[PDB]
């Protein structure tokens, strides 16, 4: 009846598919997040340390924020990918607190360890944190004071909040000069339409970072330059900027036109018609007096010798993102027809000068007060100093990006976490149930942000935190820790502020990161 | 159930275990089907060593070819165990278990239970035991009919060897068996009858010797070869040197004392030789006409052989345990171990003692006894397989004829026993029996399985097996009404029936009894088994 | 196993119609729609079909840009010929380019004089055959002694195009696979 | 007695074929082996269920506590499990609700029938028993209905419909996600005094646009849609025109070229001079007619050329690619226009209306928002999800797909009436079937009783996930049904659940009639197939 | 053989394999008894022709012109 000697049993899952039951896997998932958490533990704070990562392709990448550190390390574990997703989400939405949101997410998982060791299943502890966030977000809104009541100046607001962003970086001593760059850069943008692509920074080598300069114009980097370059004047007084999407090339990318002729006299006409058409396009541009011609697609060789004669500047092979930044500065839009041009579409600038830095040449527009864009030429010693300072000012721009939309001041230095925690402790004592110990653990998890500020500074943490617990018994606000005077005090007197969106999205993202892998008990991996 | 327990195993159950026992049975049956009968085919067995051994015995085929199947090893032990005590009926057990399984398996496919089928074989077996009492015939041994023993000897010898070897080797067995019967009527096969190998002129020159033949002779040339009247002496004492239980050095001091102590080696031997000389002085009369021979079970020192050679005493050393237990039966003397107490009564008698040698070996012949109580069968042969073929033929022939003298009955063969049980089981009233229910086919299955044996004899002759039973069936239909008790047979020469009473074909009593009993037990146990498996530590 | 695959793999759109009466419609028409789509892709890729007698300024575009094609990595093979009219092998290779151009319309066939190609090129090394693909030189071939020399044939040139990955092995246009109609006629009669 | 004879049917079917018939023990091998995956769907059941992370061979990680999404990716070698796999997929594609009951009720019928097969009851009789028990179950569910709804238009009435469905998946978010789904359905349904004759509804009406970052409370409803796309050419006016006519062209805006390939042929140089202006005047004749009627937005599916884009920039016409064909027709439903592969000219009847189009960043990426106010819409809506992780937003999408699939399950048939949930009607069916088994004497009565015992897992699985003792609240719940008030008894999930009694109407937990009928039928048909098979034949790899 | 049976008729494949298995079983029972296969197959053909002379008398004729639904249902149910 049977087909053969024996019949081995079937494994239900595929051969090699890992699976496990019980409380061991969720503890392993929590320990996996804590293992990723320990890498970013000493990074938190102004006195924190950077992290050096080298991937398989052997490209050095130094960073301080946890957004790109987790992007470099390709994470296999799904539970450890939760910290990476919120870090990119925090980087995409706000742009600040990418390290603290991962530390708070792991600390809630760390404080959930002994409750999971108890018989309480994960559906109780999820309800406690989810109930606590509903009061924490409201308490941050109640502690948010408005700036217009004092009738202060608007220029000093951006400088005050951007000073906090330049901590824990290479800039904190040179922040007196570079904070004016990003504040004046973002103010040139339109308040209604604030764009993230108009703040592109070129990774130009050479030079010290303090030698940079902020200009309302935009640069592009010299392009291919067929013979013709270094004959035109590289300095103009009031040049007219022109942009053309049409490809000025003698049938380079055009489709192959099958020309068929049957006469010798017409062969002289058809070969001169190529010269006749291309010169008609040059003469039409010549009549308008366009002193600076630009194009995304390449410029022909004959045009360079023609524009070199009448001191007309030309450049091609510009990218779409860089060319879009030019149009926001120089006014009129792009036209791809030489006959449909108009004087009114041309731009203008009060000064123009080409100067070399780092053995590279960059054309710089100058004197453009009507420009709704900006540029930054960060120069730096190595290549990672440029990239680190690049993403640092991108985070500084991200603070003033969101500060203009909504103007809310909140405490800093770990103070906002403690006023929220002690309020939840006052709310927890009236519960008298299982949710009391959970909310007290949520209050203990918010205390961790003051810890790493003190651990990286070298001072003992248990003594100073007990001093704050004695200080927060009475009514007090903007009470945290500082490092200059080596003694705690009023942060408002010390003049340090932050936005409220950083703390709100951090608590929601950290609790959502916690509830994702506390609402599971198994991780199956095929293959 | 076995795969999750054992990570590696094999399991057959409920259809393959039944097919295995039947397929292995039909496979092993086809091997020994052609050998059964007088016109069967011979079968040689050559291993990797290259030696050759030829015989038709199923035991030699089974106990020399290694077998892997779990069913056949039980058929091997069953075929071997039945033959090891009885000496006949080896292939008959294989054919019964080889046929009874396939004949019952057709009804297992129909859906009959194995338990009630084997219940029918057991109650049918009891009917055959009751039928053996009526089927057998009484024979009185006081007549001492030598022609009756000749016909029994040709039954087994014609099956193994041809008529040329049967006619010359038949009276060799009859003369050996004629001396077995005595007043005490105690049968003795292993001690009395023996077989010895000897490469000589041909197998046809096998002769019967009434006395005990020995495979050794006189070492020295001067010792006598032929002796007319030799009085034997049995001594189990060892007359060479003995190392003496921890005894160590003959600490000699001077050179003269060295050889003086070396001469004491002879004193222990000469103390025993003097008792033989004192015994020879009593029987010293007619010394040239008469003689004396000494047979020792252990070795004799070569220094002492010259003592026997001077007195013309024949010396034979290193005899077997069995030969010392046979000299009293042949020569009529008595055995002795120690040399202290001797007498002339223990000495035997022999009428002729001579030696003949070929190549390097030498044989001693003893014969012409006054009243020999035992004898030997010295078989001649050409090749080693010729001796092995004569070994199995004489081993199976002596056991078959010896069992006739044990009891007072004998069973005629040639299919008379199987054909008689067929009509008995198929015509007997079932109300007399205690079996009911689905035992209808169990009687028919075992009754029909017995018919395949006598036609297997026909399958070797080439005739049609179903047609040569037509007149056999018609004979028994009229024999019951004709008022004449006769038993039919199966003659393969002409392809017609015969009478084993006048032709001389016979079979022993305990062969067919133990065969069906051993076959029914093995076949029943194989049917009830419904699962095969292998498991263990290795 | 291959007997089931030979019904579809070893028959073009013209040969697949033979199995319309024998094989199932859904089994056959499912593959004919697949092969019909492949034929349409080759028609869109047929941007060439005659030898492009170019000059140098243009080389920097025709030879190399083309090799990038769409840059969907739509690469395009570009066979260059540094012609030299004094050599006998050059005129033979020019005939092979025009013959292959009429068949393989997707592959670009480029020709230029060798004296105008490289400054002071060795005349002994001409004729030269270069094969560009995605801007990279796949093969820098030397004079045609490898391809038989003076006795070079069209069959040898088509075999070289298969080695560099320009044409598939089982292409119906290759003379090795394009059996004559009289050849297939004898096979059906003797079958 | 060392090597076996090797099963002399080995000349028959090859070694790769494995037979696992009965008598040998197939039923015992199967019902058991599948208990591992039965516990997977059992642990993921209820509002407190645990989601399961499934990493496929490609590496796309998913985390979903359903059953259809999990078993689709699990490569399962066991054939008897696969009967339960695609049987659950039938519930997903047809009704979109009840995947879990099916994987649980179908497996429990095999688990509870261990007593019938082990006692020695015939397999053929068990199939006849569950079939007759299935018929009695379908007839009896109609009598226990108390939620006969006839309005099915207003938003507050859907609180008894959508919120029980959303309360199962991620119980913590009820009011927020129910507001998004309920407000989406109100935008989908048209404004009318009496809409009848089975109005059309489809799952493709309500779409889900996933945006990275942002708390779940900051989400909002959009009547149009939102694409991750870069606008080109200009900035919008956003209040000046007050309304915009949007033309959707299947073919691109370019000179009409044929399918067969052509090229440019010029016999003389006179045509060479006019060819540069001929292409400009050709499109100008076709582009000027579009601007006369005031089409302030054009949507071309294929790639738009630069010559066509240049003429549109000066007039201030919005352009958009929309390469995929499925999402191209959904934009037409918003404006209320038809596709036009012909260029032609814009007509007033075929052109729709759109209030405004504005561009911003929601999660850092620039997107195009087609939100309109005071306009007429028909079967179109979107829900902008804000979340911390992409892994969590994937589960919100399927939860919304199951929510709107229930709307398809209501409006497509004539009645999608409610039933008491939270372990209320399941225990009632145990009492009905217990009384039904005594009415019909016969050997099949044992099958009728064991069919009722399989419904026990529904109440206790909510208690097991709640960390409660099954032997206390489950027998205490039977005492509450002794005797309307006894019908609305259910399983409580709270710290005060020691009593084990909570009224259903306080929170309005309800289930669908058609969903449970289709689930019980597919569950019985799944168990019918597994109990009917006796031999299972495998193959190599 | 089952392919040719299912091709022309479409029913009775299980009867073909059982008849061939039983015919070889019942025939091999007699081949082991010393009977040649030739006369065994000769008896099957005479038995086959005898069954056709039994089958043509065993069949029954009905009138399908009425097109009754009851007979087609029970025939289809079988
Ligand atoms: N001037 C300051 N005084 C006190 N605390 C500060 C100051 N600047 C930054 N911090 C604290 O340092 C912590 C880490 O900031 P940092 O790591 O620089 O930003 P991010 O984590 O976004 O990269 C913040 O939680 C903040 O409270
Ligand atoms: N010459 C013969 N004529 C008829 N029957 C014979 C003859 N020789 C042997 N047989 C039958 O063959 C059978 C088997 O004989 P034997 O060889 O002694 O036993 P086994 O074959 O079991 O070793 C006996 O039953 C006997 O009747
Ligand atoms: N707050 C609550 N109180 C009581 N029962 C609840 C609550 N929330 C959800 N439930 C119950 O949890 C069950 C989950 O069922 P589910 O498997 O999601 O349905 P389906 O199988 O149709 O998708 C529902 O039947 C519901 O009655
Ligand atoms: N309900 C029934 N009762 C008794 N015999 C039946 C029944 N149905 C079919 N059979 C028998 O089974 C045989 C084969 O029928 P069927 O199973 O339909 O064909 P196949 O064996 O090729 O699948 C027929 O000869 C018929 O006699
Ligand atoms: Mg920061
Ligand atoms: Mg014998
Ligand atoms: Mg549901
Ligand atoms: Mg049938």
Cα separation of A51 and D330, whole Å? 47
Cβ neighbours of residue A181 closer than 8 Å, sequence gap 6 or more: A212, A214, A376, A393
**Taking a C-beta distance cutoff of 8 angstroms, is the pair B533, B10 a contact?**
yes
Q: How many CB atoms lie within 10 A of CB A148?
A: 8
Q: Do C65 and A252 touch (CB under 8 A)?
A: yes
Q: Indicate the pairing of strand D366-369 with strand D358-361.
A: antiparallel
Rounded distance between C-alpha atoms, residue B379 and residue B168, angstroms: 11
Set of chain A residues whose Cβ sits within 8 Å of the Cβ of B532: none
- Are the C-beta atoms of A513 and A37 separated by less than 8 Å? no
| Measured distance CA(A413)–CA(A449) in Å, rounded | 8
Distance CA B268, CA B30 (A): 66
Pairwise CA distance, residues B363 & B361, whole Å:
7
Instruction: Kindly tell me the burial class for residue A439, based on how many C-beta atoms sit within 10 Å of its own C-beta (0-12, 13-18, 19 or more).
Output: buried
Are B50 and B180 in the same domain? Answer: no
Cα–Cα distance for residue pair B81/B77, rounded to 1 Å: 6
Contact A109, A122 (CB under 8 A): no
The rounded distance, in Å, linking the Cα atoms of C10 and C29 is 15
CA triple D381-D385-D386, angle to 5 deg: 150
CA D308 to centroid of chain Cα atoms: 41
Q: Looking at the partner chain, which of D263, D392, D495 has a beta carbon nearest the beta carbon of A433?
A: D495
Q: What's the full length of chain C, in residues?
A: 191
Q: Residue written as tokens 């499109």?
A: D283
Q: Is B332 left (phi over 0), alpha (psi -120 to 50) or beta?
A: left
> Measured from the CA of B489, which atom of ligand 2 is nearest?
4
Q: What are the φ/ψ torsions at residue B80 (nearest 5 degrees)?
A: -75, -45
Task: Say if CB C145 and CB C156 are below 8 A apart.
Answer: no
The candidate with the shortest Cα–Cα distance to A108, out of A122, A97, A88, is A122
Separation of alpha carbons A505 and D484, rounded Å: 48
Contact B4/A at CB under 8 A: yes
In angstroms, the CA B302 to CA B304 distance is 5
Q: Does any ligand 3 atom lie closer than 6 A to the CB of residue D45?
A: yes
For residue A286, give both structure tokens: 């010549």
Question: Residue D469: how many CB atoms within 10 A of its CB?
Answer: 11
Burial label, B58 (beta-carbon count in 10 A; 0-12, 13-18, 19+): buried
Last residue of a domain, one of B408, B427, B462: B408
Helix ranges, E9-60 (H): 13-31, 37-58
Choosing among D258, D261, D540, which should be mutated to test the C contact, i.e. which has the most C CBs within 10 A? Answer: D261
Spatial distance between the Cα atoms of A282 and A296, rounded to a whole number of angstroms: 17
Using CA positions, which residue lies closest to atom 19 of ligand 3? D98
- Total domains in the fold of chain B: 3
Crossing angle of the two packed helices B440-449 and B416-427, in degrees rounded to 10: 160
A227 touches chain C (CB under 8 A): no
Omega before residue A196 within 30° of 0, cis: no
| CATH number, position D290 | 3.50.7.10
C117 alpha-carbon distance from chain centroid? 24
- CA neighbor of A187 nearest in space, from A22, A401, A482, A28: A401
State the best of E33, E35, E36 to mutate against chain B, taking most chain B CBs within 10 Å. Answer: E33
Closest by CA to B356, choosing from B231, B216, B196, B222, is: B216
Q: With beta carbons less than 8 A apart as the criterion, state whether D233 and D408 touch.
A: no
Sign of CA dihedral A446, A450, A456, A461: negative
Do B79 and B71 contact (CB within 8 A), yes or no?
no
Residues 6+ positions from B128 with CB-CB distance below 8 Å: B421, B516
3-state secondary structure of D43: helix
Order of strands, sheet of D246-249, starting from the edge strand that comes earlier in the sequence = D246-249, D297-300, D318-320
Q: Which atom of ligand 3 is nearest to the CA of D491?
A: 4
Closest alpha carbon to D337 in D321, D318, D322, D352: D352
Q: Which residues pair with B376 in a beta bridge?
A: B209
Ramachandran angles phi, psi of A241, nearest 5°: -90, 130
DSSP symbols for D312-335: HHHHT-EEE----SHHHHHHHHHH
Q: How far apart (Å, rounded) are the C-alpha atoms in residues D359 and A508?
A: 26
Which ligand is in closest contact with the Cα of A171? 1
Which of B8, C1, A15, B7 lies closest to D541 in space, CA to CA?
A15
Q: Which domain holds residue A188?
A: 148-215+404-410
Q: Which of residues 8-27 of B touch A (CB under 8 A)?
A: 9-16
- Which strand ranges, in their side-by-side order, compose the sheet holding A292-295? A241-244, A292-295, A313-315
- Are residue B505 and residue B418 in the same domain, yes or no? yes
CA D509–ligand 7 middle distance (angstroms): 12
The residue of chain A nearest to residue B15, with distances taken between CA atoms, is A1
In this structure, the answer to whether residues B111 and B247 fall within a common structural domain is: no
Q: What is the DSSP code (8-state) at residue D303?
A: P
Q: Are residues B19 and B91 in the same domain?
A: yes
What does each C-alpha distance from B271 to B259, B263, B277, B278, B312 come to in angstroms? 19, 13, 10, 11, 19
Query: CB–CB of A256 and C47 under 8 A?
Result: yes
| HSE, side-chain direction, 13 A CA sphere, residue D85 | 17
Main-chain phi, psi angles of A477, to 5 degrees: -145, 155
Contact of B214 with B323, CB cutoff 8 Å: yes
Dig out the tokens for B287 from the structure. Answer: 């010394």
Question: C-alpha distances in angstroms, C36 versus C10, C45, C48?
Answer: 15, 15, 21
At residue B498, φ and ψ (nearest 5 deg) are -155, 180
Coil/strand/helix, residue C50? coil
Cα R_g (chain C), whole angstroms: 20
- Residues just before a chain gap in chain E (C–N exceeding 2.5 Å) are none
Contact D246, D295 (CB under 8 A): yes
Residue B120 near residue B445 (C-beta atoms within 8 A): yes
Q: Which of A198, A158, A191, A187 is nearest to A373 (CA)?
A: A198
The C-alpha atoms of residue D293 and residue D246 are separated, in whole angstroms, by 11
**What token pair was written down for E33?**
């008894």
CATH number of A176's domain: 3.30.260.10
Query: Could you identify the atom of ligand 1 that is nearest to the CA of residue A48?
Result: 17
Q: What would you measure as the largest C-alpha separation in chain A, in angstroms?
A: 105
Side-chain-side CA neighbours of residue D194 (13 Å): 2
Which ligand 4 atom is at minimum distance from the Cα of E11? 22
Strand B376-378 and strand B195-196: the pairing is parallel
**Pairing, β A351-356 against β A235-236:** antiparallel
The structure tokens listed for A66 are: 């946890």
Instruction: Report the separation in Å between the CA atom of E11 and the middle of ligand 8, taken as the mean of its atom positions.
Output: 5
Tell me, using a 6 A CB cutoff, whether residue A348 lines ligand 1: no
Measured CA to CA, the distance from residue A446 to residue A455 in angstroms comes to 16
Instruction: For chain E, say whether B459 makes contact (Cβ under 8 Å).
Output: yes
10 Å Cβ neighbour count for A223? 18
Q: Please tell me what DSSP assigns to residue A451.
A: H
Strand arrangement of the beta sheet that strand D61-64 belongs to: A520-525, D51-55, D61-64
Of B157, B191, B159, nearest to B174 by C-alpha is B157
DSSP D442-491: STTHHHHHHHHHGGGHHHHHHHHHTT--HHHHHHHHHHHT----GGGEE-
Give the CA diameter of chain D.
104
For residues B29 and B130, membership in a common domain is answered with yes
Query: Which stretches of C27-186 are assigned E, i.e. beta strand?
Result: 52-53, 77-83, 108-113, 128-133, 136-141
- Contact of A153 with A183, CB cutoff 8 Å: no
The Cα–Cα gap between B83 and B76 comes to 11
E55 phi/psi in degrees, rounded to 5: -75, -40
The CA distance from D18 to the nearest CA of chain B, in Å, is 13
**Domain span holding position D325:** 226-412
Q: Is the CB of D224 under 6 A from ligand 3?
A: no
d(CA D54, CA D70): 7
Residues A249 and B535: their CA atoms lie apart, in Å, by: 86
Bridge partners of B214, per DSSP, are B364
Partners of A293 in beta bridges = A242, A314
CA distance C47 to chain D (A): 9
CA separation for the pair A506, B173 (Å, rounded): 113
Q: What residues form DSSP beta bridges with A314?
A: A293
- Same domain for B365 and B461, yes or no, is no
What is the C-alpha to C-alpha distance for residues E5 and A376, in angstroms, rounded to an integer? 85
State in Å, rounded, how far the first CA of chain E is from the last one.
24
Q: Of D293, D292, D309, nearest to D254 (Cα)? A: D309
The answer to whether D231 and D395 are in contact (CB under 8 A) is no
Residue of B nearest to A3 (CA): B16
Residue nearest to atom 24 of ligand 3 (CA): D422
Contact A189, A373 (CB under 8 A): yes
CA distances to A381, C127, D273 from B94, rounded to whole Å, are: 100, 91, 112
Give the range of the structural domain holding residue B227, as residue numbers without chain letter: 211-372
CB D160 within 8 A of CB D146: no
Question: Of B124, B115, B135, nearest to B426 (Cα)?
Answer: B124
Quick one: closest CA in B to A1, which residue? Answer: B15
Length of chain A: 527
Please give the method by which this entry was determined.
cryo-EM
Q: Do B3 and A1 touch (CB under 8 A)?
A: no
Rounded to whole angstroms, the Cα distance separating C92 from C94 reads 5
First and final CA of chain A: distance in angstroms?
A: 35
Strands (E), C26-180: 52-53, 77-83, 108-113, 128-133, 136-141
Chain D residue numbers touching B10 (CB-CB < 8 A): 4
Instruction: Show Cβ contacts of residue B196 under 8 Å, excluding neighbours closer than 6 positions.
Output: B213, B215, B376, B378, B379
| CB within 8 Å of D144: residues ≥ 6 apart | D419, D420, D425, D428, D487
> Nearest residue of A to residue D31 by CA position?
A12
Q: What distance in Å separates the CA atoms of residue D30 and residue A9, rounded to the nearest whole number? A: 10
In chain B the first and final C-alpha atoms are separated, in Å, by 21
Residues of E in Cβ contact (< 8 Å) with B465: 33-34
> How far is ligand 1, taken at its centre, from the CA of residue A96, in Å?
10
Q: 3-class secondary structure for B477-522?
A: HHHHHCCCCCCCEEECCCCEEECHHHHCCCECHHHHHHHHHHHHHH
Strands C108-113 and C52-53: parallel
Residues B204 and B305 in one domain: no
CA of B6 vs chain A CAs: smallest distance (Å): 10
Strand partners, B498: B489
- Taking Cα atoms as reference points, which of A497, A395, A520, A444 lies closest to residue A82? A520
Partners of residue D10 in chain A, C-beta under 8 Å: 3-5
Angle separating helix axes A434-446 and A122-142, nearest 10 degrees: 60
B1 touches chain A (CB under 8 A): no
For chain D, the straight-line distance linking the first and the last C-alpha, in angstroms and rounded, comes to 33
Question: Is residue B195 domain-shared with residue B182, that is, in the same domain?
Answer: yes
B531: contact with A, CB 8 A cutoff: no
Strand (E) or helix (H) holding A518: helix A500-518
User: What does the alpha-carbon distance between residue B238 and residue B268 come to, in Å, rounded to a whole number?
Assistant: 11
Q: Which of E10, E14, E58, E77 to mutate to test the pocket of ligand 4 (most atoms within 8 A of CB)?
A: E14
Pairing outcome for strands D226-227 and C52-53:
unpaired
**Resolution expressed in Å:** 3.0
In sequence order, which residues have a C-beta less than 8 Å from that of residue C99 and are 6 or more positions away? Answer: C154
């Amino acid at each position: 009846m049977n087909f053969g000697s024996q019949t081995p049993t079937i494994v239900v899952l595929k051969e090699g598919t890992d699976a496990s039951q019980g409380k061991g896997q969720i503890i392993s998932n929590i320990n996996a997040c804590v293992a990723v958490q320990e890498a970013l533990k000493p990074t938190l704070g102004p006195l924190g340390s950077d992290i050096l990562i080298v991937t398989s392709n052997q490209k050095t990448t130094i960073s301080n924020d946890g957004a790109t550190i987790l992007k470099l390390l390709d994470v296999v574990h799904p539970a450890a990918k939760t910290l990476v997703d919120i870090s990119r989400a925090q980087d995409a939405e706000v742009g600040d607190g990418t390290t603290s949101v991962t530390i708070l997410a792991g600390e809630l998982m760390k404080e959930a360890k002994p409750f999971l060791e108890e018989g309480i299943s994960s559906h109780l502890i999820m309800k406690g944190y989810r109930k606590a966030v509903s009061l924490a977000v409201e308490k941050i809104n109640e502690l948010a004071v408005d700036i217009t009541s004092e009738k202060s100046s608007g220029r000093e607001l951006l400088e005050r909040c951007a000073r906090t962003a330049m901590s824990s970086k290479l800039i904190h001593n040179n922040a007196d000069f570079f904070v004016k760059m990003c504040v004046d850069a973002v103010l040139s943008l339109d308040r209604n339409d604030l764009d993230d692509k108009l703040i592109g920074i070129k990774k130009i080598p050479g030079g010290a970072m303090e030698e940079s300069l902020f200009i309302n114009g935009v640069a592009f980097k010299k392009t291919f330059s067929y013979a013709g370059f270094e004959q035109q004047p590289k300095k103009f007084n009031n040049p007219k900027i022109l942009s053309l999407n049409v490809e000025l090339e003698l049938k380079a990318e055009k489709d192959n036109a099958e020309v068929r002729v049957e006469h010798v006299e017409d062969y002289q006409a058809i070969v001169d018609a190529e010269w006749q058409l291309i010169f008609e396009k040059l003469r039409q541009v010549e009549e308008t007096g366009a002193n600076i011609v630009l194009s995304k697609l390449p410029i022909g060789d004959l045009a360079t010798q023609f524009f070199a004669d009448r001191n007309i500047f030309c450049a091609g092979r510009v990218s779409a993102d860089d060319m879009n930044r030019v149009i926001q500065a120089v006014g009129g839009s792009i036209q791809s027809t030489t006959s449909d041009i108009k004087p009114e579409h041309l731009g203008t600038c009060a000064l123009f000068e080409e100067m070399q830095i780092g053995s590279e040449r960059y054309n710089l527009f100058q004197g453009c007060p009507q420009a709704k864009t900006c540029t930054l030429l960060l120069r730096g010693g190595a290549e990672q100093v440029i990239a680190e300072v690049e993403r640092s000012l991108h985070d500084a721009i991200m603070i003033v990006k969101r500060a203009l939309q909504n103007k809310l001041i909140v405490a800093g230095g770990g103070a906002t976490e403690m006023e929220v925690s002690k309020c939840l402790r006052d709310y927890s004592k009236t519960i008298a149930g299982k949710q009391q110990m959970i909310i007290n653990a949520f209050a203990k998890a918010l205390e961790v942000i003051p810890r790493q500020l003190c651990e990286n500074a070298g001072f003992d943490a248990i003594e100073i935190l007990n001093k704050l617990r004695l200080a927060h018994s009475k009514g007090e606000k903007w009470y945290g820790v500082v490092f200059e005077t080596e003694n705690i005090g009023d942060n408002f007197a010390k003049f340090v502020w932050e936005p409220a969106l950083v703390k709100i999205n951090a608590l929601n993202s950290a609790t959502e990161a916690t509830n994702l892998i506390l609402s599971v008990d198994e991780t199956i991996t095929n293959k | 159930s076995l795969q999750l327990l054992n990570p590696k195993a094999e399991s057959l159950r409920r259809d393959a275990a039944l097919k295995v026992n039947v397929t292995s049975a039909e496979g092993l049956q086809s091997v020994l089907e052609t050998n059964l009968g007088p016109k069967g085919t011979l079968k040689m067995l050559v291993d990797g060593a290259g030696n050759i051994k030829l015989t038709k015995d199923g035991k030699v085929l089974l106990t020399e070819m290694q077998i892997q199947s779990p069913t056949a090893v039980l058929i091997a032990r069953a075929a071997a165990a039945q033959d090891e005590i009885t000496g006949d009926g080896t292939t008959t057990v294989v054919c019964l278990v080889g046929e009874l399984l396939r004949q019952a398996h057709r009804f297992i496919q129909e859906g009959v239970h194995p338990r009630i089928i084997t219940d029918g074989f057991e109650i049918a077996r009891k009917e055959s035991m009751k039928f053996l009492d009526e089927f057998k015939i009484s024979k009185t041994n006081l007549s001492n009919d030598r022609e009756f023993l000749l016909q029994v000897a040709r039954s087994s010898l014609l099956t193994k060897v041809d008529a040329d070897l049967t006619e010359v080797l038949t009276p060799i067995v009859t003369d050996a068996v004629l001396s077995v019967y005595d007043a005490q009527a105690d049968n003795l096969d292993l001690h009395m009858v023996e077989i010895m190998q000897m490469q000589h002129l041909s197998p046809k020159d096998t002769t019967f010797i009434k006395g005990l033949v020995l495979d050794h002779g006189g070492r020295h040339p001067d010792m006598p070869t032929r002796v007319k009247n030799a009085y034997v002496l049995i001594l189990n004492v060892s007359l060479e040197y003995e190392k003496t239980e921890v005894n160590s050095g003959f600490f000699y001091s001077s050179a003269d004392q060295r050889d003086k102590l070396a001469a004491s080696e002879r004193k222990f031997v000469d103390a025993k030789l003097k008792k033989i000389i004192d015994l020879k002085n009593e029987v010293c009369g007619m010394d040239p006409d008469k003689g004396f021979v000494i047979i020792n079970q252990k070795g004799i020192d070569p220094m002492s052989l010259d003592v026997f050679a001077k007195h013309n005493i024949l010396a034979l050393r290193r005899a077997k345990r069995r030969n010392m237990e046979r000299l009293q039966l042949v020569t009529g003397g008595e055995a002795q171990n120690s040399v202290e107490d001797l007498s002339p009564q223990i000495l035997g008698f022999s009428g002729l003692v001579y030696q003949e040698t070929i190549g390097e070996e030498k044989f001693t012949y003893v014969t012409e006894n006054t009243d020999p109580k035992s004898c030997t069968i010295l078989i001649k042969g050409s090749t080693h397989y010729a001796l092995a073929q004569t070994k199995d033929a004489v081993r199976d022939g002596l056991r078959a004829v010896a069992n006739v003298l044990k009891d007072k009955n004998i069973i005629p063969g040639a299919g008379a026993f199987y054909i008689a049980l067929s009509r008995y089981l198929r015509s007997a009233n079932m109300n007399k029996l205690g079996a009911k229910g689905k035992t209808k086919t169990g009687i028919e299955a075992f009754a029909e399985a017995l018919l395949v044996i006598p036609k297997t004899l026909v399958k070797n002759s080439g005739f049609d097996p179903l047609d040569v039973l037509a007149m056999v069936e018609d004979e028994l239909d009229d024999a019951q009404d004709s008022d004449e008790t006769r038993y039919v047979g199966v003659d393969l020469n002409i392809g017609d029936s015969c009478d084993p009473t006048i032709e001389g074909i016979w079979d022993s009593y305990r062969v067919l009894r133990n065969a069906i009993t051993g076959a029914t037990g093995i076949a029943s146990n194989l049917l009830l088994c419904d699962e095969l498996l292998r498991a263990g530590r290795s | 196993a291959k007997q089931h695959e030979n019904r579809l793999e070893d028959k073009d759109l013209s040969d697949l119609e033979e199995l319309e009466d024998d094989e199932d419609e859904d089994f056959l028409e499912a593959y004919k729609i697949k092969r019909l789509n492949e034929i349409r892709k080759l028609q869109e890729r047929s941007k060439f079909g005659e030898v492009f007698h170019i000059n140098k300024p243009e080389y920097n575009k025709e030879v190399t840009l083309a090799s990038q094609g769409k840059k969907d990595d739509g690469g395009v093979y570009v066979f260059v010929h540094l012609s030299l009219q004094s050599k006998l092998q050059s005129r033979i290779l020019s005939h092979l380019f025009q013959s292959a151009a009429c068949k393989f319309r997707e592959i670009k066939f480029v020709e230029i004089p060798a004296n105008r190609a490289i400054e002071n090129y060795p005349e002994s090394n001409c004729p030269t055959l270069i094969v560009y693909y995605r801007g990279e030189v796949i093969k820098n071939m030397i004079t045609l002694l490898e391809l038989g020399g003076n006795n070079s044939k069209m069959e040898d040139f088509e075999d070289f195009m298969v080695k560099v990955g320009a044409v598939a092995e089982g292409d119906n246009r290759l003379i090795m696979n394009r059996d004559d109609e009289e050849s297939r006629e004898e096979r059906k009669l003797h079958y | 007695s060392l090597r076996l004879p090797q099963n002399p049917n080995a000349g028959l079917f090859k070694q790769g074929y494995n037979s696992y018939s009965n008598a040998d023990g197939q039923i015992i091998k199967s019902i058991a082996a599948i208990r591992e995956l039965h516990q997977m769907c059992l642990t993921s059941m209820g509002p407190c269920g645990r989601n399961k992370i499934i990493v496929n061979h490609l590496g796309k990680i998913i985390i979903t506590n359903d059953a259809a999404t999990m078993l689709r990716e699990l490569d399962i070698v066991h054939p008897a499990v696969k009967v339960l796999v695609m049987a659950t997929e039938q519930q997903k594609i047809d009704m979109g609700d009840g995947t879990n009951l099916v994987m649980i009720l179908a497996g429990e019928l095999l688990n509870v029938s261990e007593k019938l097969i082990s006692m020695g009851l015939s397999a053929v009789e068990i199939i006849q028993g569950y079939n007759m028990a299935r018929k009695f179950t379908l007839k009896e569910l109609d009598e226990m209905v108390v939620g006969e709804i006839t309005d099915k238009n207003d938003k507050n009435e859907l609180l008894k419909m959508i919120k029980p469905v959303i309360s199962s998946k991620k119980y913590g978010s009820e009011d927020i996600l129910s507001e998004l789904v309920s407000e989406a359905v109100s935008h989908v349904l048209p404004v009318a005094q009496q809409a009848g004759e089975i109005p059309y509804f489809n799952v493709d009406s309500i779409r889900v646009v996933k945006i990275m970052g942002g708390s779940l409370s900051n989400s909002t409803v959009i009547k149009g849609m939102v694409f991750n796309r870069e606008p080109e050419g200009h900035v919008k006016s956003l209040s000046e025109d007050k309304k915009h006519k949007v033309a959707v062209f299947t073919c691109p805006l370019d000179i009409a070229n044929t399918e067969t390939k052509g090229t440019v042929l010029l016999h003389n140089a006179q045509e060479m001079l006019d060819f540069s202006k001929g292409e400009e005047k050709q499109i100008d004749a076709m582009m000027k007619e579009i601007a006369d009627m005031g089409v302030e937005c054009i949507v071309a599916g294929a790639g738009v050329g630069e010559l066509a884009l240049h003429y549109l920039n000066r007039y201030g016409i919005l352009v958009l690619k929309v390469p995929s064909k499925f999402e191209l027709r959904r934009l037409c439903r918003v404006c209320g226009a038809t596709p036009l592969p012909r260029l032609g000219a814009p007509t007033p009847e075929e052109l729709g209306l759109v209030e405004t189009v504005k561009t911003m960043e929601i999660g850092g990426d620039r997107v195009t928002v087609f939100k309109q106010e005071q306009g007429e819409i028909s079967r179109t809506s979107t829900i902008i999800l804000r979340g911390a992780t992409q892994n969590n937003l994937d589960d919100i999408e399927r939860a919304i797909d199951d929510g709107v699939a229930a709307v398809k399950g209501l409006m497509k048939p004539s009645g999608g009436k409610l039933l008491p949930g939270a372990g209320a009607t399941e225990i009632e069916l145990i009492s009905r079937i217990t009384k039904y088994g005594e009415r019909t004497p016969g050997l099949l009565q044992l099958a009728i009783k064991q069919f009722a015992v399989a419904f026990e897992v529904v109440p206790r699985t909510l208690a097991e996930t709640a960390g409660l003792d099954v032997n206390e609240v489950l027998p205490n719940l039977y005492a509450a049904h002794n005797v309307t008030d006894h019908l609305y008894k259910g399983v409580d999930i709270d710290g005060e659940s020691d009593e084990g009694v909570k009224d259903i109407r306080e929170e309005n937990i309800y289930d669908m009639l058609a969903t449970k009928k289709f689930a019980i039928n597919v569950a019985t048909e799944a168990a019918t197939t597994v109990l009917s098979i006796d031999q299972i034949i495998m193959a190599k790899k």
